[PDB]
């Protein structure tokens, strides 16, 4: 199992110190180097730098000043840390994996990433709301049930359906940034109509950003 | 440092189809290019190294060549859950450089929204707030106009809109407009309605309660 | 279950060409151009078996010229130098006194040429080492082995040197009797 | 005298150290699936690293895999009595190097070599020099199976005809525990066990 781990705050106040561990199992940080790649929401990809498995350290020179890269061998872990972050360094944060001390060794095995947000606002947890089914969300022989998770800081929320056991159906929409400055966003499931009554839906949304655990219980309405 | 352009921006193609995605380099890049496909929420992955070496784990309908100066990325028969953004990318020299990405959607048939209204909960509205949701199930294409009207007349400024990417089966996506309002501002009005204008729907379909 | 490829190759400008049979990533045999004979890869196998070369090197022929029809309708497009992968390996696990082999095992590489030299306490071995063939994989670059038969000491320390196109500099490999375990 | 036979190149269609370098591979590929009962004849060629043109044995004639081969598939589609070759070469050529070479390829048997080890705990049970590569190897903790703390190298080809593999196991040995590996293999008429002896 080759697997690369990102892991860090989330959360960061402008011109402070970014702080991620890349922690990497199935392979050795002695016969392998790692790069750290950064993408901002919507945009590109973006090359931060590598650490080779002897050791050697090469940064972008937009960032030459901000960037530093280390490596615990015994941990199985890298560390890469930004100084006086700004609002562009807001980027889902990549640790990807490569062949010896040489440039021309291709990238193999992305990590999934981690989302830093820099911002100088404080957290806050999701309110769960059920997005009841009525006559009106019912066509007819299908009806709709939701939940929407509002007025939280910072992304992500994830939203699962009976801790798993519902997954034909799901969509959980991309938040939307409110103007009050918090996010919001909507998971509905489609489910047979018949099938109300007798079968319990329950939404689980973690917000482990700001440690919050909500399962909420989506019931029938009548309006 | 080293530039890539890469063309086209967006590409639409059907199931079967034959699509070729190229990357222009500034300098010489010696063969050392590498073609990622990151699907949405997901990181990208390896698809093809050294301008034509396929990876382990990468289908052999995706093939990598030179068209002369410009390199090539071919997927000869396409499939519905190939939807997502390619990358080129050089690692001839430092820094490696991607491209900006294209955006490769499915095309298929026309297919109508399901119109869903959720009204606000009981929770909330005793919290202060209201929000009601207009749900548009699995449509294609993405456009779709999405009103409020509230008795009647049309509402602008306080709805959002957020769209599902592409389903990677039936190559739909989906719409969820919310409308906020404040409680006061909610329990002013009776009739509540989101009105769905769509390429799939002959006339526009319009679904609602009263408060 | 099984896969046997008869794998051939040519590369110009250094005009080397190379036939050969595998079994399941074995080479069985392998034509020499030099020479104009089959080289079974274990000595017991053409004893088993036997293979005319000259209709091999007839094929090798062909290649070249095939070679020179991609070469024009490629527009003169190079090959990637893709740098090869270098670990050294040990027959046995090593006691100290008692016969073992290095073998450095080279991986995931293209153009198949390769300057590989064996160093005792960075001396160079150029007697008594054995190589196999540039093995053909199936991402349809190349692999190589090297043996260098040995007896382990405490105070000898050796190094596999590759040298490729894909590398600015010659790739070193170190391998002592102590710390003989770097496989994670 | 059992002979090799060889599949011959096809001859294509006409459209010193820092130097460019061009390659071109040709692959005849035989895919053996129960013995000599499903047989796939495969007959492939590339340019550098990548295929232009291949003959596939359940689809029946050369197709271009890059556009490059176009002109070449087209002209050797254009020969039907090339094409029956290509097609007879599965019985003709795949069986028949199947068939002289069995004796000492497919039922090639060596005894493997065990030993056991601990390391920088670790227990380490390295197998070597063994053929062909279905092997199997268990780590009995106290005549418990563990399944959690093994970690295999895999198989590592050596080129002598030769297989080895390094299965280590994390664990906490403390006072007298008794530790077992166990090796599978076909070389093997019964399953081969050695003990560390705390
Ligand atoms: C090997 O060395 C020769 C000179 O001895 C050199 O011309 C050749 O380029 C080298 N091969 C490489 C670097 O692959
Ligand atoms: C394999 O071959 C044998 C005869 O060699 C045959 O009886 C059998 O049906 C074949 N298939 C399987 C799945 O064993």
Same mark, same amino acid.
């Given at each position: ?26 392979? =050795? ?11 901002? /929401? ?10 080779? !498995? ?89 009806? !709709? ?49 018949? =099938? ?23 019931? /029938?309405?009548?309006? | ?7 086209? &921006? ?17 300098? %010489? ?126 509402? &602008?400024?306080?709805?959002? %809109? &957020? ?10 996506? &989906? ?37 | ?115 590989? *030299? ?8 150029? *007697? ?57 | 005298?059992?002979?090799?036979? +060889? #599949? ?18 040709? +692959? ?50 254009? #020969? ?16 028949? $190097? ?21 390391? +920088? $705990? ?5 197998? $070597? ?70």
């Amino acid at each position: 199992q080759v697997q690369l781990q990102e892991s860090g705050p989330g959360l960061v106040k402008p011109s402070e110190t970014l702080s991620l561990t890349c922690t990497v199992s199935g392979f =050795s940080l002695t016969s392998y180097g790692v790069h750290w790649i950064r993408q901002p /929401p919507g945009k590109g990809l973006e090359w931060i730098g590598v650490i080779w !498995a002897g050791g050697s350290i090469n940064y972008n020179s937009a960032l030459m000043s901000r960037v530093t890269i280390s490596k615990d061998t015994s941990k199985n872990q890298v560390s890469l840390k930004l100084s006086s972050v700004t609002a562009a360094d807001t980027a889902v944060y990549y640790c990807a994996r490569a062949y010896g001390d040489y440039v021309h060794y291709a990238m193999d095995y992305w990590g999934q990433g981690t989302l830093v947000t820099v911002s100088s606002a404080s957290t806050k947890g999701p309110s769960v709301f059920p997005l009841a089914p009525s006559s009106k969300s019912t066509s007819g022989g299908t009806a !709709a049930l939701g939940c929407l998770v509002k007025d939280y800081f910072p992304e992500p929320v994830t939203v699962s359906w009976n801790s798993g056991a519902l997954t034909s159906g799901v969509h959980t929409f991309p938040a939307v940034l409110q103007s009050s400055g918090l996010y919001s966003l909507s998971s509905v499931v489609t489910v047979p109509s018949s =099938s109300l009554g007798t079968q319990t839906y329950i939404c689980n949304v973690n917000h482990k950003p700001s440690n919050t655990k909500v399962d909420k219980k989506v019931e /029938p309405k009548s309006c | 440092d080293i530039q890539m352009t890469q063309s086209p &921006s967006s590409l639409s193609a059907s199931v079967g189809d034959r699509v070729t995605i190229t990357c222009r380099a500034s300098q %010489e890049i010696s063969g050392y290019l590498t073609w990622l496909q990151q699907k949405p929420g997901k990181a990208p992955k390896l698809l093809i190294y050294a301008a034509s070496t396929l990876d382990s784990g990468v289908p052999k309908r995706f093939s990598g060549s030179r068209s002369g100066t410009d390199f090539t990325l071919t997927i000869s028969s396409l499939q519905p859950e190939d939807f997502a953004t390619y990358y080129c990318l050089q690692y001839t020299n430092y820094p490696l450089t991607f491209g900006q990405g294209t955006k490769l959607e499915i095309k298929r048939t026309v297919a109508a929204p399901s119109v869903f209204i959720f009204p606000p909960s009981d929770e909330q509205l005793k919290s202060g707030t209201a929000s009601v949701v207009c749900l548009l199930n699995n449509f294609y294409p993405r456009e779709a106009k999405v009103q409020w009207k509230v008795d009647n007349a049309l509402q &602008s400024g306080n709805s959002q %809109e &957020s769209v599902t990417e592409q389903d990677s089966k039936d190559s739909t996506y &989906s719409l969820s407009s919310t409308l906020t309002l404040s409680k006061a501002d909610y329990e002013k009005h009776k009739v509540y309605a989101c009105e769905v204008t769509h390429q799939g729907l002959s006339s526009p379909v319009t679904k609602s309660f009263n408060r | 279950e099984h896969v046997i490829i008869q794998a051939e190759f040519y590369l110009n400008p250094d005009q080397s060409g190379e036939f050969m049979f595998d079994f399941d990533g074995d080479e069985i045999f392998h034509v020499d151009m030099a020479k104009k004979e089959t080289v079974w890869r274990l000595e017991e196998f053409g004893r088993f078996a036997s293979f005319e070369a000259q209709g091999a090197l007839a094929n090798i022929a062909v290649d070249k010229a095939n070679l020179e029809i991609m070469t024009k309708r490629s527009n003169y497009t190079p090959i990637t130098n893709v740098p090869p992968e270098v670990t050294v390996l040990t027959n046995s696990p090593v006691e100290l006194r008692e016969p073992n082999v290095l073998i450095c095992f080279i991986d995931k590489f293209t153009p198949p040429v390769v300057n590989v *030299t064996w160093l005792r306490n960075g001396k160079p071995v150029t *007697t008594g080492v054995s190589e196999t063939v540039f093995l053909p994989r199936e991402d349809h670059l190349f692999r190589k082995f090297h043996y260098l038969p040995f007896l382990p000491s405490t105070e000898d320390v050796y190094d596999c040197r590759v040298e490729h196109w894909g590398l600015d500099e010659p790739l070193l490999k170190h391998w002592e009797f102590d710390t003989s375990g770097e496989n994670l | 005298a059992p002979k090799y036979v +060889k #599949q011959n190149t096809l001859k294509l269609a006409t459209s010193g150290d820092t130097r460019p370098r061009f390659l071109e591979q040709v +692959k005849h590929e035989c895919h053996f699936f129960n013995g000599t009962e499903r047989v796939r004849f495969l007959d492939r060629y590339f340019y550098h690293q990548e295929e232009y043109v291949r003959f596939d044995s359940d689809v029946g004639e050369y197709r271009a895999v890059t556009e490059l081969g176009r002109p070449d598939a087209e002209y050797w589609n254009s #020969q039907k009595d090339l094409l029956e070759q290509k097609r007879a070469a599965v019985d003709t050529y795949c069986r028949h $190097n199947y068939g002289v070479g069995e004796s000492f390829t497919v039922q090639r048997r060596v005894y493997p070599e065990v030993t056991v080890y601990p390391a +920088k $705990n670790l227990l380490v049970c390295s197998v $070597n020099g063994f053929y062909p590569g279905s092997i199997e190897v268990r780590w009995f903790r106290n005549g418990q199976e563990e399944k959690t703390g093994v970690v295999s190298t895999g198989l590592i080809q050596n080129g002598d005809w030769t297989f080895q593999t390094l299965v280590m196991l994390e664990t906490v040995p403390r006072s007298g525990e008794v530790y077992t590996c166990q090796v599978e293999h076909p070389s093997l008429t019964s399953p081969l066990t050695v003990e560390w002896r705390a």
